[PDB]
Amino acid sequence: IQAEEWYFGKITRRESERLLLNAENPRGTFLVRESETTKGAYCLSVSDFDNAKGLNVKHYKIRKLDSGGFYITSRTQFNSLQQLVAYYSKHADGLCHRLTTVCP
């Protein structure tokens, strides 16, 4: 995964909000990074646009089940991080937008 286009490793929440808040990018642009906060968790930061809030980034924690799996909600779990990005690129299922472009 150090070699996945969307995996930005251990960047901070500020760094990802800086990399993502760009009005030239389409909503649903995203990156997967490590959670600063929960040791062993990942985060899926996605930009969105709300008429009022304008451009905003949302952060979804991704927890690794003890067996190995990954989940954002109870509806679905993925056996890998790439299956999770793949699924949410086709179905938002709760996220603000389905994932479109990987962060530039």
Place this chain on the structure above:
Amino acid sequence: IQAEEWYFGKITRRESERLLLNAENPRGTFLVRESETTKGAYCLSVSDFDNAKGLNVKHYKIRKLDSGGFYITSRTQFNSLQQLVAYYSKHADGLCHRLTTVCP
């Protein structure tokens, strides 16, 4: 500096890693670019690898002093990015590896 072989301008953090993470590059291949995230600072991106994570890129911010100079640590300051690049080619001096190859 726009024509320096090692200077890669405004490329993104993500594009720098795409350039550096490649089998043809020695540990210590590098480039200098603008920091996307901190206007007015630069960034020295260096390829490295370990037998655990494989090839990975380390990013070191380069701050510009108001008096002209540049630094990555309090140990030494440099009057130009040319000076900084030459110093870290002879000495890692904090960095994961001394600078060996200008990124192709």
